[PDB]
Amino acid sequence: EKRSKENLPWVEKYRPETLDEVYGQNEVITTVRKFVDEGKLPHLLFYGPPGTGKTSTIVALAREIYGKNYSNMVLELNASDDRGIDVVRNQIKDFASTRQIFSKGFKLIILDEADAMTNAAQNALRRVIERYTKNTRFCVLANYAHKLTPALLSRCTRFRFQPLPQEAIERRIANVLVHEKLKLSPNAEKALIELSNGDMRRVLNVLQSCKATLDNPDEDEISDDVIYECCGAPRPSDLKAVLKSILEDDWGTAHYTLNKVRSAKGLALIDLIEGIVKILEDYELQNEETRVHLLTKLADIEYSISKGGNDQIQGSAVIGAIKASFENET
Amino acid sequence: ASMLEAKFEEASLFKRIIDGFKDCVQLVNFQCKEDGIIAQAVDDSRVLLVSLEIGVEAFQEYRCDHPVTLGMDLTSLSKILRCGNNTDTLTLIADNTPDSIILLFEDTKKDRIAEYSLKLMDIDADFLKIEELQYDSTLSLPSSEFSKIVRDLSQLSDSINIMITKETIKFVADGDIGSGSVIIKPFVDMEHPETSIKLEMDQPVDLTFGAKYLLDIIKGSSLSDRVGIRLSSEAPALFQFDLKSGFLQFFLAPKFN
Amino acid sequence: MSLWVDKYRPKSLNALSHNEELTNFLKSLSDQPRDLPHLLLYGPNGTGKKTRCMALLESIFGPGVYRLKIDVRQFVTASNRKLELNVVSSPYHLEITPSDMGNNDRIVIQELLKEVAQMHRYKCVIINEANSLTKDAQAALRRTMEKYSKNIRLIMVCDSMSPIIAPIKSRCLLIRCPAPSDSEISTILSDVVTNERIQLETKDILKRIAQASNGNLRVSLLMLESMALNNELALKSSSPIIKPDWIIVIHKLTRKIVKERSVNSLIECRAVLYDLLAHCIPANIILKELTFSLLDVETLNTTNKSSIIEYSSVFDERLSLGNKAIFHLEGFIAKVMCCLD
Amino acid sequence: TLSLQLPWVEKYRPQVLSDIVGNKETIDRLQQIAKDGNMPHMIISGMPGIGKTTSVHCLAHELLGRSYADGVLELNASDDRGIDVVRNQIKHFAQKKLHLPPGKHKIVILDEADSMTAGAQQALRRTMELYSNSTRFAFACNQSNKIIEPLQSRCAILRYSKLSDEDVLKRLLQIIKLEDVKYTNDGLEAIIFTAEGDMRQAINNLQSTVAGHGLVNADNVFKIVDSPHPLIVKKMLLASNLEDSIQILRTDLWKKGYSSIDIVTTSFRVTKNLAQVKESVRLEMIKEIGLTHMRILEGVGTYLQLASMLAKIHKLNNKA
Amino acid sequence: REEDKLWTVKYAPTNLQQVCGNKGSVMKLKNWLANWENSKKNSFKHAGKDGSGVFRAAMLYGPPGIGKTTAAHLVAQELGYDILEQNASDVRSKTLLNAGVKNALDNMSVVGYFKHQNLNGKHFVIIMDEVDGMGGVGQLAQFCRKTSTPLILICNERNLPKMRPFDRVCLDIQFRRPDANSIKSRLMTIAIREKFKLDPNVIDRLIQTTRGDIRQVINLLSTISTTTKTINHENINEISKAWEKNIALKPFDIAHKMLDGQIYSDIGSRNFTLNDKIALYFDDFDFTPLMIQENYLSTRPSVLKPGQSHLEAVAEAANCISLGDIVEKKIRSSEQLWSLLPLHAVLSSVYPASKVAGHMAGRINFTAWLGQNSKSAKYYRLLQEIHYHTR
DNA sequence: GCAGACACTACGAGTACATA
DNA sequence: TTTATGTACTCGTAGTGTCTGC
Ligand SMILES: Nc1ncnc2c1ncn2[C@@H]1O[C@H](COP(=O)(O)OP(=O)(O)OP(O)(O)=S)[C@@H](O)[C@H]1O
Ligand SMILES: Nc1ncnc2c1ncn2[C@@H]1O[C@H](COP(=O)(O)OP(=O)(O)OP(O)(O)=S)[C@@H](O)[C@H]1O
Ligand SMILES: Nc1ncnc2c1ncn2[C@@H]1O[C@H](COP(=O)(O)OP(=O)(O)OP(O)(O)=S)[C@@H](O)[C@H]1O
Ligand SMILES: Nc1ncnc2c1ncn2[C@@H]1O[C@H](COP(=O)(O)OP(=O)(O)O)[C@@H](O)[C@H]1O
Ligand SMILES: [Mg+2]
Ligand SMILES: [Mg+2]
Numbered sequence A: 001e002k003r004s005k006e007n008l009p010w011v012e013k014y015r016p017e018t019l020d021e022v023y024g025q026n027e028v029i030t031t032v033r034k035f036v037d038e039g040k041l042p043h044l045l046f047y048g049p050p051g052t053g054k055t056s057t058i059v060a061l062a063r064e065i066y067g068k069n070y071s072n073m074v075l076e077l078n079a080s081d082d083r084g085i086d087v088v089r090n091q092i093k094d095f096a097s098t099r100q101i102f103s104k105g106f107k108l109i110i111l112d113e114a115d116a117m118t119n120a121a122q123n124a125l126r127r128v129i130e131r132y133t134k135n136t137r138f139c140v141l142a143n144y145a146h147k148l149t150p151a152l153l154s155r156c157t158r159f160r161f162q163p164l165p166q167e168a169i170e171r172r173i174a175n176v177l178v179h180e181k182l183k184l185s186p187n188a189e190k191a192l193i194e195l196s197n198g199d200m201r202r203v204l205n206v207l208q209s210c211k212a213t214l215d216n217p218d219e220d221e222i223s224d225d226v227i228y229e230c231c232g233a234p235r236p237s238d239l240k241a242v243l244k245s246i247l248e249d250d251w252g253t254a255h256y257t258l259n260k261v262r263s264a265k266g267l268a269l270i271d272l273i274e275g276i277v278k279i280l281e282d283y284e285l286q287n288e289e290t291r292v293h294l295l296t297k298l299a300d301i302e303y304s305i306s307k308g309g310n311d312q313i314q315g316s317a318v319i320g321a322i323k324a325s326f327e328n329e330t
Numbered sequence B: 001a002s003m004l005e006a007k008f009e010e011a012s013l014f015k016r017i018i019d020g021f022k023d024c025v026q027l028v029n030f031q032c033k034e035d036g037i038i039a040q041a042v043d044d045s046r047v048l049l050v051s052l053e054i055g056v057e058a059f060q061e062y063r064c065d066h067p068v069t070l071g072m073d074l075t076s077l078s079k080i081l082r083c084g085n086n087t088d089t090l091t092l093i094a095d096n097t098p099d100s101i102i103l104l105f106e107d108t109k110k111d112r113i114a115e116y117s118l119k120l121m122d123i124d125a126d127f128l129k130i131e132e133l134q135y136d137s138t139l140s141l142p143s144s145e146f147s148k149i150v151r152d153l154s155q156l157s158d159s160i161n162i163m164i165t166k167e168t169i170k171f172v173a174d175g176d177i178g179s180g181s182v183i184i185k186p187f188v189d190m191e192h193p194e195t196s197i198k199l200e201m202d203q204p205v206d207l208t209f210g211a212k213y214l215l216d217i218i219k220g221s222s223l224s225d226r227v228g229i230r231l232s233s234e235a236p237a238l239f240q241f242d243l244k245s246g247f248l249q250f251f252l253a254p255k256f257n
Numbered sequence C: 001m002s003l004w005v006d007k008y009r010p011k012s013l014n015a016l017s018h019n020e021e022l023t024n025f026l027k028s029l030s031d032q033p034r035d036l037p038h039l040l041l042y043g044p045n046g047t048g049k050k051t052r053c054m055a056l057l058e059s060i061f062g063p064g065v066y067r068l069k070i071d072v073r074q075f076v077t078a079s080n081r082k083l084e085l086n087v088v089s090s091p092y093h094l095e096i097t098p099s100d101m102g103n104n105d106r107i108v109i110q111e112l113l114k115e116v117a118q119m120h121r122y123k124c125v126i127i128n129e130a131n132s133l134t135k136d137a138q139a140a141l142r143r144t145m146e147k148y149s150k151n152i153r154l155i156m157v158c159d160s161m162s163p164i165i166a167p168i169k170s171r172c173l174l175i176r177c178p179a180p181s182d183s184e185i186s187t188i189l190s191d192v193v194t195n196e197r198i199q200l201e202t203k204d205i206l207k208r209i210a211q212a213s214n215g216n217l218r219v220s221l222l223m224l225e226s227m228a229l230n231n232e233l234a235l236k237s238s239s240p241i242i243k244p245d246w247i248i249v250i251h252k253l254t255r256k257i258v259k260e261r262s263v264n265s266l267i268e269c270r271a272v273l274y275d276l277l278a279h280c281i282p283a284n285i286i287l288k289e290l291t292f293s294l295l296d297v298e299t300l301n302t303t304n305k306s307s308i309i310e311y312s313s314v315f316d317e318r319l320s321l322g323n324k325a326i327f328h329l330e331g332f333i334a335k336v337m338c339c340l341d
Numbered sequence D: 001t002l003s004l005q006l007p008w009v010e011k012y013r014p015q016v017l018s019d020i021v022g023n024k025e026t027i028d029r030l031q032q033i034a035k036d037g038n039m040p041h042m043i044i045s046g047m048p049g050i051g052k053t054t055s056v057h058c059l060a061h062e063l064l065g066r067s068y069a070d071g072v073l074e075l076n077a078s079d080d081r082g083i084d085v086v087r088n089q090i091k092h093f094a095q096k097k098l099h100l101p102p103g104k105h106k107i108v109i110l111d112e113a114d115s116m117t118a119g120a121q122q123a124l125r126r127t128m129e130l131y132s133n134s135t136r137f138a139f140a141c142n143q144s145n146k147i148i149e150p151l152q153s154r155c156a157i158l159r160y161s162k163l164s165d166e167d168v169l170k171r172l173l174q175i176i177k178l179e180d181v182k183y184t185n186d187g188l189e190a191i192i193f194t195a196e197g198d199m200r201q202a203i204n205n206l207q208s209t210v211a212g213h214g215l216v217n218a219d220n221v222f223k224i225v226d227s228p229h230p231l232i233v234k235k236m237l238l239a240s241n242l243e244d245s246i247q248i249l250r251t252d253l254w255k256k257g258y259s260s261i262d263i264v265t266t267s268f269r270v271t272k273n274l275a276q277v278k279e280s281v282r283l284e285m286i287k288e289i290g291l292t293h294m295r296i297l298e299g300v301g302t303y304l305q306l307a308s309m310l311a312k313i314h315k316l317n318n319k320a
Numbered sequence E: 001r002e003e004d005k006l007w008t009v010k011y012a013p014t015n016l017q018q019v020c021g022n023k024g025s026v027m028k029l030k031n032w033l034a035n036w037e038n039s040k041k042n043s044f045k046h047a048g049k050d051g052s053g054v055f056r057a058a059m060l061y062g063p064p065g066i067g068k069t070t071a072a073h074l075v076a077q078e079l080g081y082d083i084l085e086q087n088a089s090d091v092r093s094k095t096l097l098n099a100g101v102k103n104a105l106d107n108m109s110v111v112g113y114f115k116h117q118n119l120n121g122k123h124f125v126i127i128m129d130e131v132d133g134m135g136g137v138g139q140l141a142q143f144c145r146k147t148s149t150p151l152i153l154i155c156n157e158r159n160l161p162k163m164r165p166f167d168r169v170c171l172d173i174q175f176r177r178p179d180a181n182s183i184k185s186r187l188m189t190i191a192i193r194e195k196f197k198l199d200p201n202v203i204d205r206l207i208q209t210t211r212g213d214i215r216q217v218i219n220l221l222s223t224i225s226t227t228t229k230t231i232n233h234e235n236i237n238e239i240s241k242a243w244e245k246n247i248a249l250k251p252f253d254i255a256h257k258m259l260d261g262q263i264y265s266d267i268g269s270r271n272f273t274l275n276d277k278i279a280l281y282f283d284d285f286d287f288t289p290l291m292i293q294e295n296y297l298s299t300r301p302s303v304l305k306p307g308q309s310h311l312e313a314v315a316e317a318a319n320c321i322s323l324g325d326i327v328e329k330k331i332r333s334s335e336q337l338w339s340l341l342p343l344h345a346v347l348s349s350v351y352p353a354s355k356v357a358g359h360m361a362g363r364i365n366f367t368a369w370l371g372q373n374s375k376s377a378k379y380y381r382l383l384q385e386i387h388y389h390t391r
Numbered sequence F: 001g002c003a004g005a006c007a008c009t010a011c012g013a014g015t016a017c018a019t020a
Numbered sequence G: 001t002t003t004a005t006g007t008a009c010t011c012g013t014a015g016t017g018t019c020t021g022c
């Protein structure tokens, strides 16, 4: 690292250095603290969506158990490091079999993003874990469970990291604003909550980019308007107006309204499709055929947009799909 | 001109020192100071720890006012040392917190001059203060004898168990082919002072070690005529190879159970 | 050579008596070649795109582009498979095609374009049949022409636009090559025959060749040469319009599909398809010919025609995303049999 | 850093054949082999965590005693079991002359035998056939399909089945009485339901609940460990109302932090393992789930894709 | 000794009159090895009565555990020929094979000198048991061309292409599944010798489920007699289900089982669920998609829905075959998504064969897309050659 | 000591698997 | 038998090194 902090992104600057600094997962953190205070630590398996605080939790845990130099006492392997079955047969076996080199303690092995390991590597790791579990504990961080061997799943204690609720994001945002001498309006905070979609890195990145957006970093408050231009996400009022124009107004008015909304501040049809999806999910529909047609046609449109294409034709397709789906209901 | 200057008497010394622990370690963290140059490096399995230290007396000329952290890579370092005549005089050159160092492979003493440079590597791992402690035993046997014993026993088992009890060194390695039980009785000789099995005793020790790591240790036996092994039940094994002005330890971690 | 298709080819833009507007546009580009961008000529095959490319090349530098040589280049891939693909090189330009196996033409593109970019300031790189690229070599090309441009230039020739990805369309200038008019086909054939020694009863034969060729001048010249050889160098007004044996096989398959709509006839259809795929034919053109020959049968209905064309579109989409074309073609024939029955 | 207490999975591992619960006939046959001594070559197969390798180790311990240090050669995936460097090891071990009791033989525990290559098993064929008097083998593989048919032609097939709820409950109650932790029958049945006949999972969940809340009551159990998502997926796919299926999807998987690809794979597995609905209906369900799977793997992973998958599954299920 | 030896070892046949079934094959082997020396004196320029005069080498194949090794051993020992066996436990590499029994191809038995009237106890009979456990096959074939000693080979599957050079260099002797009567008699003798009762109707089901594997039958008898010496007709189904052998299936038989109309019936799906169909596909995942496509349109369909003709079912199966083509293309590409194999299994084998299931119109034909594709690839190469030459 | 002999590590080409 | 990367295994070869010897 260079120049200590203040030269890092807010994602890597506000990384929790203690188990007390991890928010949201209250149950998991309390259970882990009880585990390490009572002296028992089984093979841990942390599962959850990206950005929920798995590797931060395990790094804080290893820092708490050991001294400051946790990296000198932990064999932390990642997908960047080669993890073939020869690596399991040699490096993992030697680290598990031998005694600690710096003090008296149990060896800890952290396998971040272990879902990328091959099937044979996991098969070897099975017996490696089970044989030398007396003085060596394995931790597996996996975003995807279908890539893990069921034998490996049946061996490690499963901990699920839920997406961060509202209160955890609010507390972290309050801490960040206190540190950074920054002010932010509550409606902007709610917009950040809706924009996060359970991710914390998204929140930190949007805060950093919005502080960069302001001409004067101090004094000026971050409103939801600044959030919406900086992220580029559609405003809820724009989505409501577009949906109303589509539902009631005819083709000329609806097409002109959608084009004007998109060209006002450079909206994309994506993020607008699932904004409309959220708004329509907030409706009650008497006929299931409306739901079926909406879901199928909008999924096809989103797939086509993901593959890329002509935006005008896709917008016309969106309008046609919605208007054809809300006429079968009556 | 440059802040850090270290002109070796010969490139052979540095080549031998690097090749001593090149195989067992990938990343090396040199720390140049006015007292000398040290290098604390850890194996990938984090079992075998190497602590190089070269005194100021092994350099024909040496000067380094500001402490420098030279994190490097032994593969590319050995590749750089591979090219260049061994009789040539190497001169390590570095700047004030640089991105690289300069290897003066000055051929003979005139004419050809080389300027091989290796980009410096950002190793943020601080040096580990594992110097020594109250060791239970302190033996000292010739490097050739220890290397021969380790090479003979590695073919019989995957683990060599070193036992010291009542002024006696005993190596045992039980495996599939057989079980070696090479034993050594301490002695001293005035006729040939180099071969002398020195020993000290506080408490008996029964520590087992891997075979490949011990082979990695004995690969460095060419540097020193004598090797000093110190063991303890609550300390990693120490293998102090004595150099012309410094030393080269090997902190090996024993197996448990 | 003795073939008339490669004996009379216009070397310069002055001899391009095909399209006045396209020749004028190419001459506009050749007026100041110091800043000529990358081109991409598209249109029906047989129009003469390569002729325009070579004419523009010799208008940029000078005479001598038309002298060519063969230089086989050894290329190594994953494992140790050898797929040595020759390049038809020349002074002042370089001609390449993705005739190599499609799954690993990306390496051919990568190292060959990197080798030619090691240095009359630029060497044009013509890529025939660019629509056959597999969206992986095009990814390399995206930065290949963008990074090094003052030293290398591309004239990317392809007969279709759909497989070419959006960035390649974006960074390349688009030039359109319409097919010749029937009057122009007849004029070109008349000039060829009066430079040749074939006797014509009436120019109606040239018009019939123009109508049968369907805007394809290359097959028009080939058919004229074949007829002249078969008619003892004296064309007859009653000479039947000879078709390629491939067209005959397609039409016989269409007749068998139309008349008999049983499973056994589908078995002989599968056998004929196996033979045709063994006869070096792309899947897109054979499905297109089968579809358009099916729609030309007069015993069909408009509903059957609509169903056939819709399933033809579906199975052509399947061809664009499939490996073994025989399954898709057999499925299309099965659906056609189901609809007609 | 204090020395860790051994986990209850390994602390209470059985050491005698009597403590293994489930598959009473197989355990009794193993006991009769143990006192008889005439151990044949056997292959042990079953789902993970039901007591395969522990029975092998217990039988090896019981048949031969103080000779356990050198009279048994144990191999596993961590050892580089290849055709060349390892054929010599078993060849020497079988050719090794060690004096046993009259009715006992050397044991070669080729643990996790489904991961070996074909050539290793081809050599093991004649290795087993030659020295059948001196050494005996013991394969312990999760899947018996990888083992070639010549190896199956000279082995005793011992198929373990998933543990019944009564046996898991019995051994669990034994563990509670040895550990003296306050328990409620509702919590125990919650542990049984969560384990799905996987014994090690039951012990691990018991550990987590005991050391997380002290009491193993059902609320604490469901707080610590979640219900198995295959059951939730099966409930979602079998619902009759599309709104109900969408609500189950969202609330129980999307708001609980489950990846879309995990939901799709679990839906495919549930559909292929489901039997209530008609075979053809399962075929179109599998086809649609696979189309959504291709969409997910190609890059677009969204709640909308899963919602469309459920909508089309309801289209096929409701018969238009 | 007794009680400390495997049942499949102590009850091994002692003479050629103790082999269960395969009397014709053992008789043929005995005739061939009893007349090899006459063929040697004839210099292999003509055949004999049964044709043994042209082939100095023979090879034995069959299902496992039927008696190939025992027949070879007894035939070699009865005439006194000294056995010299090579096995998969030892190296059969080309260099070591040339450094192994290559000199022994025309030497003499020194132990035959020391052992011993035994007139023909002074020669090598060479035994490559487990030939399939392999340029070893080329060296073995070249040995078969030139050998001065009796030579036989034991393998399991002739149809593998790696024993294709053995097509006409050996006297093939085929061993089949033995008839249940001899095995019944042998198990009666074994049961009355080992104190446990056996019920005659049980042997038929044991052979049926074990698929004619006598060694596994003996192992089953031993294991059952460990704790329950009495074998009756009550637990016969329990034992058969517990010891059922999940043998792999050949591509033609895979196509036959996939196209059988019973498995897709309502009653037939209780035991043979679609999971079993996926497992059956996964045995040979490279030939099943090709095998299904080439004979899904040459059957009488027996699972036609009401109001649906055979052509409609053919088209609806072809649609999913085309979908499976795209799935395979995504699987075998740069992305390399091998988690998509179960989907390809359904879309390429199960669903297309779930609509055209029934008895064969003709018979299952080998895949022709491989040969057609190879010929097309060569024709493409020759087309490229002439295209570049004339350019 | 130079020469041969020796067995070792290192390297390269080929084959086969890829969901339970 | 084509497939089209990445992984793992296996073998074979070429040198490279120290060890015996005259
Ligand atoms: N519960 C939390 N409390 C505070 N900060 C958090 C929390 N969860 C995530 N973060 C922040 O998110 C940043 C990156 O997330 P990490 O926890 O390091 O990675 P991760 O959450 O495990 O996601 P993956 O699966 O590794 S990509 C951290 O540096 C923290 O600043
Ligand atoms: N029948 C049983 N009785 C008692 N404990 C059991 C039983 N089955 C499993 N266990 C426990 O399961 C743990 C180890 O089970 P193992 O036998 O090692 O799993 P496994 O059968 O080998 O499955 P895999 O394929 O190796 S993951 C120990 O804590 C045992 O106490
Ligand atoms: N026909 C038979 N009659 C009696 N016992 C038999 C018969 N065939 C096999 N056995 C028994 O099975 C044992 C082994 O038979 P083998 O001939 O070795 O099997 P195999 O033919 O070699 O098949 P492989 O080599 O495993 S593929 C013999 O020792 C007998 O106990
Ligand atoms: N202006 C023209 N006058 C006469 N013939 C022409 C003209 N332009 C093209 N051709 C004919 O077109 C043929 C070459 O076509 P080609 O460039 O191969 O088509 P494609 O590029 O579609 O394969 C030549 O034989 C040539 O006679
Ligand atoms: Mg992480
Ligand atoms: Mg196990």
Ligand SMILES: [Mg+2]
Binding pocket: E068, E069, E129, E130, E154
């Ligand atoms: Mg045999």
